[PDB]
Amino acid sequence: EVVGKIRSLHTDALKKLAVKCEDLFMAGQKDQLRFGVDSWSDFRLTSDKPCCEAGDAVYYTASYAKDPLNNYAVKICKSHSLAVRQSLAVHFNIQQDCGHFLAEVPNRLLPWEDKQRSHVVVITREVPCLTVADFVRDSLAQHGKSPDLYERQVCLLLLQLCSGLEHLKPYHVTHCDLRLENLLLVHYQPTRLIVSNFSQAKQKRDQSRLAPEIITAKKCDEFQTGILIYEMLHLPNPFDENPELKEREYTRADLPRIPFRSPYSRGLQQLASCLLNPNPSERILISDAKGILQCLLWGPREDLFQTFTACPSLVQRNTLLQNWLDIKRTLLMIKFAEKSLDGISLEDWLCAQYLAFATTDSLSCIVKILL
């Protein structure tokens, strides 16, 4: 009775807090700029070394001549990506741009060159500092020394990736080129992940990242996300370590084993196995992967899993999950209230998103997958 009223108050409040966080993290001017007579000269590069080298372009921090104190990055493409991405509403984890133009760029700036040639130059306000590939490459020693801290950051990056991929579903868009060098890391007022490079995007060697259904005769992005889990854990592409899985219809025991090094290793292993299911109809959805990642970060632990399996009735399982939700929502609400007397981190926003929209039915589905 009254318990339902307080449950509704916390749920509606956390949704409002999540929306308020979203508007605070997404604030800023987004009107596209106008370019004309030598707009390449209006961008004074603040450095000669690149600030980021992605799979589709090179990035340079620049001072726009008509606004010299705000952050701008010059994206010099290597060779459709703008057409597909411009049709999407803005999203925290999907790359935005404020204009583009052609320009003659010196070859000394391009690593894949060196005669002056014309290239597509894109301007963005979210300056990338590195890619996830660069982060993974530089974090081998930290993964060995601090497996709990590193593998938690992996879950947080994967959670942002699922959010951006979930944004593509209502458009019926598949990225089709999810590689670690296409995921950028930027700051927020470098832990903000940004999906980029839509050159292979579909609007409704290289085959090592193609789902099995593509090779035989809309779960492509889910399958490529399963490969990324291995790579972010400093493991090779499973279809490069065992290059005979694509020529068969493998099972769970055929996939290479993820080392058991942190409280997140078993869940990430189960998540990858579900994403790498050779049958598309049984391959989990990217929203289910999001729920798994939320569960590994904040959701109910394996200690509650034992009570879940031991409960004979669905009513007792619903009470167990509902009690966990009510307590976690209360704790998070207290956390926000205490900050009003002392900022809001990215993890606080994502945690509010989880508890605000989670239900006992959604938790029951995620738990049964992780069992």
> Which residue type does 249 have?
E
Helix (H) or strand (E) holding 206: none
Cβ closest to its own copies, residue 25 vs residue 40: 25
For its own copies, give the closer residue by CB, 24 or 371: 24
**Footprint of its own copies on 24-63 (CB under 8 A):** 24
Rule CB under 8 A: say whether 3 interacts with its own copies.
yes
Q: Under the criterion CB under 8 A, does residue 10 sit at the interface with its own copies?
A: yes
57: closest CA among 105, 116, 115, 114? 105
Amino acid residing at 56: D
CB of 336 to its own copies, least distance (A): 4
CB nearer to its own copies: give 207 or 359: 359
- Nearest 10 degrees: CA dihedral of 94, 95, 98, 100? -130
- Give whichever of 5 and 145 is closer to its own copies, judged by the CB atom: 5
Residue 72's H or E segment, with its range, is strand 67-77
Residue 172 as a binder of its own copies (CB under 8 A): the answer is: no
217 contributes a contact to its own copies by CB under 8 A: no
Nearest to 234 by CA among 159, 350, 153, 346: 153
What is the smallest separation between the CB atom of 339 and its own copies, expressed in angstroms?
A: 4
Window 307 to 336, contacts with its own copies (CB under 8 A): 323, 326-327, 330-331, 333-334, 336
Q: Which long-range contacts (CB under 8 A, 24 or more apart) does 12-21 make?
A: 13/333, 14/329, 14/332, 14/333, 14/352, 14/355, 14/356, 15/356, 15/357, 17/336, 17/352, 17/356, 18/349, 18/352, 18/353, 18/356, 18/357, 21/344, 21/348, 21/349, 21/352
Please name the residues in contact with 246: beta carbons below 8 A apart, sequence gap of 6 or more: 207, 208, 212, 215, 239
Q: Does 16 bind its own copies (CB under 8 A)?
A: yes
Among positions 4, 9, 119, 163, the unique one binding its own copies when judged by CB under 8 A? 9
- Residue 371 near its own copies by CB under 8 A: no
Applying CB under 8 A, which part among 5-13, 126-134, 207-215, 260-268 lies near its own copies? 5-13
Q: Cα-flanking dihedrals φ and ψ of residue 130, to 5°? A: -175, 170
Closest CB to its own copies among 20 and 30? 20
Q: In the complex with its own copies, which residue's Cβ is closer, 310 or 331?
A: 331
For position 301 contacting its own copies by CB under 8 A, the verdict is no
Contact residues toward its own copies (CB under 8 A) are 2-3, 5-6, 9-10, 13, 16-17, 20-21, 24, 323, 326-327, 330-331, 333-334, 336-341, 344
